[PDB]
Design a protein around this ligand. Structure first.
Ligand SMILES: C[n+]1cn([C@@H]2O[C@H](COP(=O)(O)OP(=O)(O)OP(=O)(O)OC[C@H]3O[C@@H](n4cnc5c(N)ncnc54)[C@H](O)[C@@H]3O)[C@@H](O)[C@H]2O)c2nc(N)[nH]c(=O)c21
Ligand SMILES: C[n+]1cn([C@@H]2O[C@H](COP(=O)(O)OP(=O)(O)OP(=O)(O)OC[C@H]3O[C@@H](n4cnc5c(N)ncnc54)[C@H](O)[C@@H]3O)[C@@H](O)[C@H]2O)c2nc(N)[nH]c(=O)c21
Ligand SMILES: C[S@@+](CC[C@H](N)C(=O)[O-])C[C@H]1O[C@@H](n2cnc3c(N)ncnc32)[C@H](O)[C@@H]1O
Ligand SMILES: [Zn+2]
Ligand SMILES: [Zn+2]
Lengths: 122, 297
């Protein structure tokens, strides 16, 4: 039953006031993209910075197993858009926040689905 | 000068036609570093300018394009270069990278170990090498042709590069190989490219464009490497990154280049013509199978 929950160990390491995981590969883009959290190509906007998924993944970076029966990674081979105001800790940001299934934006940093984009059909 | 708004500078044709002797590479701005956009890594800027330049070439870009990238690892444990290639290459392109040391990558598949142990039964559409042996810094004798990983690449280009395929091998003043320059003569065109972000280094990417499998011209490695140092010594390049501030047309267009398996004898002058324009890629279209040898002892 023993499991080495890294996320909780990293949140505590940051709460203790520790320098976050650096060397996150930041990409060069126009900054005029959709704005979605995770994409197959840099989609940053005037308020975001795009990075390489694998370089922002705690599991990939720490050479540990991904929380999933098959052990599949959702950042590797993708590009994660991070708010310019949180770009100092891209890895920690992808853990403390979750993406939206409706618009794909970060909940709290782009998503506005809980304000009626459409009238739920009728 | 005016070549500051370009991603880099290519070795002029009149410099390749010379027959100079090898000499110490004395760059005028050696050590000077370039000003990069806030928070951008050096190898992200470098691979960006390299890709920006490749866009101007007659590269063959088919559907489900195959690209292998040797020396993709770094002493930071990440693949900035692979991240750029992943961005630049059309969505659905098969990208495989490899390094001597372990690292995290956005590649569809990563192999860890000496490129010597890397084996594959498939031909590739594009080969990118950024491999450099640190032991090269120990300059104790003449600057002679290096072997090591260059031996492998020269063989991998002949056995695993698809006709119409292109390459981009990174070299320096002391990190170079005679047989590598001789192979550039087996392509429809070639050149020594120098990124502006690293124009203060003797580094350059030898670029073969549209492999033909047969020599078009008789190049001499030692002489051609002497022509390069001479060009670099007599032509100081100013450090620039102005090409990095415009990513509007960076992605490689999916030219949908044709892919045919034409044996070894149906290669007439009408096909060599099609290979020399990136309109054709000659190789098998089976499933990609790669592997790394494990030395047990
Ligand atoms: C870059 N390049 C050069 N050549 C060869 O070299 C000759 C002159 O090409 P260059 O690159 O040395 O010329 P220049 O310095 O003047 O031009 P630049 O570097 O800007 O090359 C790119 C541009 O050249 C233009 N161009 C086309 N034909 C020529 C030509 N005959 N002379 C000069 N420029 C040309 C293209 O339209 C393109 O906009 C070409 O006629 C061709 O045989 C190539 N051949 C293939 N197959 N693929 C290439 O990618 C390639
Ligand atoms: C061209 N050059 C070489 N040397 C001397 O000769 C040595 C070997 O020369 P080199 O073949 O390494 O070429 P150069 O110095 O241009 O390479 P540079 O350090 O810019 O690195 C080139 C690229 O290789 C890779 N690389 C360099 N060092 C390492 C390393 N330790 N590990 C891994 N990759 C590395 C990187 O991608 C890097 O960008 C140099 O370390 C230096 O003492 C020079 N000295 C003067 N005064 N002026 C020069 O112009 C000059
Ligand atoms: C300049 S570093 C590559 C940096 C990387 N392209 C990046 O984007 O940061 C050169 C690499 O060559 C690798 N290398 C050197 N000799 C090698 C060999 N024989 N086989 C495989 N990789 C090798 C080193 O491990 C090193 O990571
Ligand atoms: Zn991961
Ligand atoms: Zn939403």
């Amino acid at each position: 039953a023993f499991a080495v929950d890294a996320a909780k160990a990293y949140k505590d390491y940051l709460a203790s006031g520790g320098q976050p995981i650096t060397n996150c590969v930041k990409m060069l883009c126009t900054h005029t993209g959709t704005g979605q959290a995770i994409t197959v190509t840099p989609e940053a906007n005037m308020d975001q910075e795009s990075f390489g998924g694998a370089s922002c993944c705690l599991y990939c970076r720490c050479h540990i197993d991904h929380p999933n029966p098959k052990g599949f990674c959702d950042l590797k081979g993708k590009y994660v858009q991070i708010p310019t105001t949180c770009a100092n800790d891209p890895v920690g940001f992808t853990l403390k926040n979750t993406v939206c299934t409706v618009c794909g934006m970060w909940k709290g940093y782009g998503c506005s689905c809980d304000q009626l984009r459409e009238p739920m059909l009728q | 000068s005016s070549q500051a708004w370009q991603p880099g500078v290519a070795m002029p044709n009149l410099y390749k036609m010379q027959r100079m002797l090898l000499e110490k590479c004395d760059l005028q701005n050696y050590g000077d570093s370039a000003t990069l956009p806030k928070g951008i890594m050096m190898n992200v800027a470098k691979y960006t300018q390299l890709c920006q330049y490749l866009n101007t070439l007659t590269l063959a870009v088919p559907y489900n394009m195959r690209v292998i990238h040797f020396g993709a690892g770094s002493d930071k444990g990440v693949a900035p270069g692979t991240a750029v290639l992943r961005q630049w290459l059309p969505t659905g392109t098969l990208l495989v990278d490899s390094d001597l040391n372990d690292f995290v990558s956005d590649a569809d598949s990563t192999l860890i170990g000496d490129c010597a142990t890397v084996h594959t039964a498939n031909k590739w559409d594009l080969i990118i090498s950024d491999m450099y042996d640190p032991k090269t810094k120990n300059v104790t004798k003449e600057n002679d042709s290096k072997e090591g990983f260059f031996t492998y690449i020269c063989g991998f280009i002949q056995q695993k590069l698809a006709l119409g395929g292109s390459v981009a091998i990174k070299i320096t003043e002391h990190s170079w190989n005679a047989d590598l320059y001789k192979l550039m003569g087996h392509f429809a065109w070639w050149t020594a490219f120098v990124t502006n972000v690293n124009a203060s280094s003797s580094e350059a990417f030898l670029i073969g464009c549209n492999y033909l499998g047969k020599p078009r011209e008789q190049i001499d490695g030692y002489v051609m490497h002497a022509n390069y140092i001479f060009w670099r010594n007599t032509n100081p390049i100013q450090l620039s990154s102005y090409s990095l501030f415009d990513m509007s047309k960076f992605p490689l267009k999916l030219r949908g280049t044709a892919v045919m398996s034409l044996k070894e004898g149906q290669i007439n002058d009408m096909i060599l013509s099609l290979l020399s324009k990136g309109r054709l890629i000659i190789r098998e279209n089976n499933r990609v199978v790669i592997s790394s040898d494990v030395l047990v002892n």
